Design a protein around this ligand. Structure first.
Ligand SMILES: [Cl-]
Ligand SMILES: [Cl-]
Ligand SMILES: [Cl-]
Ligand SMILES: [Cl-]
Ligand SMILES: [Cl-]
Ligand SMILES: [Cl-]
Ligand SMILES: [Cl-]
Ligand SMILES: [Cl-]
Ligand SMILES: [Cl-]
Ligand SMILES: [Cl-]
Ligand SMILES: [Cl-]
Ligand SMILES: [Cl-]
Ligand SMILES: [Cl-]
Ligand SMILES: [Cl-]
Ligand SMILES: [Cl-]
Ligand SMILES: [Cl-]
Ligand code: NA
Ligand code: NA
Ligand code: NA
Ligand code: NA
Lengths: 299, 299, 299, 299
């Protein structure tokens, strides 16, 4: 667990930009990668939930993976979310991530169909084998996956050979603390941005988040406030992140983030794929004012 | 709603046979269609959940759809489950179903990501458009999709232009009755085989089910018993169906069904796709005895 | 299970009438018991959830039990819901029901606090002991108790020495059928009036319900329709019951029932105890119209 | 919200000691109050969930209320949990708390029966009126009450006239932050001991908890650590608190705490009321070792 310490940190869950016809916008994808590097992030998490993975084909996900590796390999840590319901499809994306030079792969607990815990473990084992020597990030998101793992099951997942981290998109900070106590060296990512400060305090040593794409310096600022023992500053930063998250929940989270990035002249086209609707017109002024606030807050 | 009475009835949710390398077993697929026709079913529902749709590519789902149409068009009713999370993927499968001559399409409420009710309606509207004049079956399965529709939302979905039926995989038989009372003409399929008789009594006029692939005549028998007013016979048939479903839950439902069909010399290979494990050896004897029992019962 | 067949049937879950100051209305309680006897019911279930047991003191519940025994002992079957969270409180009510001559006691699974299955079993054993020879009805209502029993745990409860029946307030009619199949002689009451017909078909042999207080003959008629094999009549009667239940849900179920009974000249004051609010004025005309319809419906 | 700052702090949810026959052990109750005062706590919360309020009579709860006031009035803050399902019963306990000189009352959202939000509000208004001048603490515990309040409803509850605080027994630290942000002056108690440190960081300014009865100085130490910016010390204290909570979850929480207190020579008899079972013999060694550790840690 200590030989993959380079995986710790704050890493945006990269959005996948699409063009006006909902195809991959490669030029905007490259700009978004460069924008995140310039924000000072530790890494990027590609083709996750926030990446709209589950409305893309395998070929599209591979194209995105390869472009991001071109832009970012050697500059920041690269984690490829390869997870699919199908084990064989996940293996194909893991083998591709290996060829592109990613530092780690990740896979969401396979969803829709009920699978036994043993089926989950063999799924991770098969993907780890196809990753062919780069570590696995187990990705736990019970609210969307419907997979309700016990603590003892999480303990077994994160000790499988080849697993180097846990992305913990759970609001249960008792379990966060229990995972940390059971695995003092484990790379443990907070997945709910709206509790980032509290999740670090409960044992996470970094985070993977959708909203880091537009204000990663606030989350980096919370990491530093807590190291410096400035708890009032950590709370103030989290209050500001959550004011933004309240707005994003009102307008649509992924499309709201893409719209801000469009007003920051990063993404040419801010659409999500159907069935996500476009942003309602009445919310544009607020999203544009947020973009301008965030740009001014950097200098 | 009156012009789609030809969609009523008992229709197996067709399994998708795979070979030893987990590719589509076309020969076994054709024999499973013929086998279901020979059982006297009213139709087949292709590429659904039971069909392992969500561990298949679009290309594979199209291949299955086209094969089934070749075997069954003009002999029994053909319903194509074209549903994906992506609207555009679902539309591609709907346009393909239209080319192959299917009698209706169907789509599960798109899952994993939370979508507004308005986003769900526009998803169905777009698929109905690509289906280009064949009716849509709305497919409600809250336990796996995570979409919890109210009665009033269901009422709006089943009256969208182009919607001709509802696949109701819900054990809430108060809602089943309310849907029937609000739409006396609606084609309404019972989706949980283990309550078929009660679901008919609560208002369903047919059923779509995984276990109909191995014993459709029991469910046709329940329809008949209730029409005849032999409530005791309906109960006894459901008891026997549920003894089977108990066994299938113990061994794994889709792989148990495929194993029974392997022991009936229908499918050459009884595998599901990973991450479904194969059947445990200790259950083979029971599954073989069930196939023997069902074959002697047939005649 | 053979020697308690006299418990089978259709039994209203008796409302507890209160007066203007929210004290027990003894005269209206007597009139409601008599009204139910004249409706032809098989028994009465006293001091249950519908009886507002959990906003009453033990002394008040005992006074209600004794009165119902005076009015109904030897005329219809008498079941006393003695259940509390506390085991000793429940035992006090069971010992009292024994003194008053009840034919059976009943206890809801103790709630609010999480208790282990063994703690639940010991709770029932102690109450059965204090009931001193009259059988126990296990009362299962997960939606309000939060106790989620497995099928195998239900199998152990209904086989405790002294248990003669199960009140099954669950809409899961697979489990209903499984209970019937494992216990062919068990007295099994359908608890959700809105699926009564389907619940009988799935294996219940009677019911306990709040709405039987105002229209027991429809549920008795459903029993008769199914015995006769008139499945269409059973459905039509269930439709009519559910039209009423729809209204009761809109206005508040217990207070709406009490208001109907008020307009039938049975109850002097149609209030529930606080924090239940009174019925909104806008619903009075509907409730009065339903009272008239149910009265004309009888003769 | 500012004129009740004397309610902020760290307050054990007092256990109710019972004797060998399950009646109130008055002598052990007095020594438990004194023990907590001597731990440096800010107040005590009397007759709550932890106090086994819902297996006691109104008369028993008043006896405990009156004894605690006699021991602690004017030494530490006194909060009386007067909550019942019944509004009238809750009012009776609030009038008593007022007579005994309590500083505040509290009530759990009424449970078991579904009540509307307006019925909850009127319940609190009525108790506040009977409390006759002392502030009300709204007490939120969705996991046991089943009352799932939105954020906007919580906002309306804490702005009711006479409401001075919220006991927030929720693990959702997004909502915790949102409440703090919407009400910067609100007295906001963290209810889940196992996330205390994180709950403070998310906006709580105190806590009410069952495990404070045996180790309040750890929780006071966490407050001090977070004020001093020693995040690492706060984390270590929370780890130790959670090692204890793990053991208490394994043995049974209330009875485990009382057993520890017995081995601390505080409680003569460590029994909870039925249906809580006694502690298993095989856990006694661990609970005794824990008692010894906590005693030696104090100094
Ligand atoms: Cl290749
Ligand atoms: Cl490359
Ligand atoms: Cl699982
Ligand atoms: Cl830290
Ligand atoms: Cl820029
Ligand atoms: Cl084409
Ligand atoms: Cl929805
Ligand atoms: Cl029918
Ligand atoms: Cl006595
Ligand atoms: Cl008597
Ligand atoms: Cl349990
Ligand atoms: Cl029958
Ligand atoms: Cl009168
Ligand atoms: Cl008095
Ligand atoms: Cl509510
Ligand atoms: Cl603080
Ligand atoms: Na890095
Ligand atoms: Na047909
Ligand atoms: Na009787
Ligand atoms: Na104080």
């Amino acid at each position: 667990h200590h030989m993959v310490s380079h995986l710790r940190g704050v890493m945006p869950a990269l959005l996948t930009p699409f063009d006006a016809q909902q195809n991959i916008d490669r030029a905007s994808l490259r700009r978004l990668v460069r924008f995140n590097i310039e924000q000072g992030v530790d890494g990027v998490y590609v083709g996750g939930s926030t990446g709209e993975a589950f409305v893309q084909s395998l070929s599209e996900r591979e194209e995105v993976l390869e472009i991001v590796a071109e832009e970012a390999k050697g500059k920041i840590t690269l984690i490829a979310h390869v997870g699919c319901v199908s084990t064989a499809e996940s293996q194909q994306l893991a083998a591709a991530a290996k060829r592109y030079g990613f530092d780690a792969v990740s896979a969401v607990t396979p969803f829709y169909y009920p699978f036994s815990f043993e089926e989950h473990c063999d799924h991770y084992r098969a993907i780890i084998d196809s990753a062919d020597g780069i570590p696995m990030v187990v990705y736990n998101i019970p609210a969307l996956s419907g997979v309700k793992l016990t603590l003892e099951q999480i303990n077994q997942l994160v000790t499988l050979p080849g697993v180097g981290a846990l992305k913990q998109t759970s609001g249960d900070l008792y379990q966060m603390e229990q995972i940390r106590r059971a695995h003092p060296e484990l790379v443990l990512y907070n997945g709910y941005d709206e509790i980032f400060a509290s999740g670090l305090l409960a044992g996470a040593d970094g985070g993977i988040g959708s909203t880091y794409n537009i204000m990663a310096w606030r989350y980096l600022g919370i990491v530093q406030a807590l190291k410096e023992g400035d708890t009032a500053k950590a709370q103030q930063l989290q209050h500001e992140c959550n004011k933004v998250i309240d707005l994003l929940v009102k307008v649509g989270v992924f499309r709201g983030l893409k719209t801000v990035l469009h007003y920051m002249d990063v993404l040419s086209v801010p659409l999500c794929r159907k069935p996500f609707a476009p942003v309602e017109d009445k919310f544009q002024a607020e999203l544009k004012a947020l973009a301008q606030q965030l740009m001014q807050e950097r200098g």
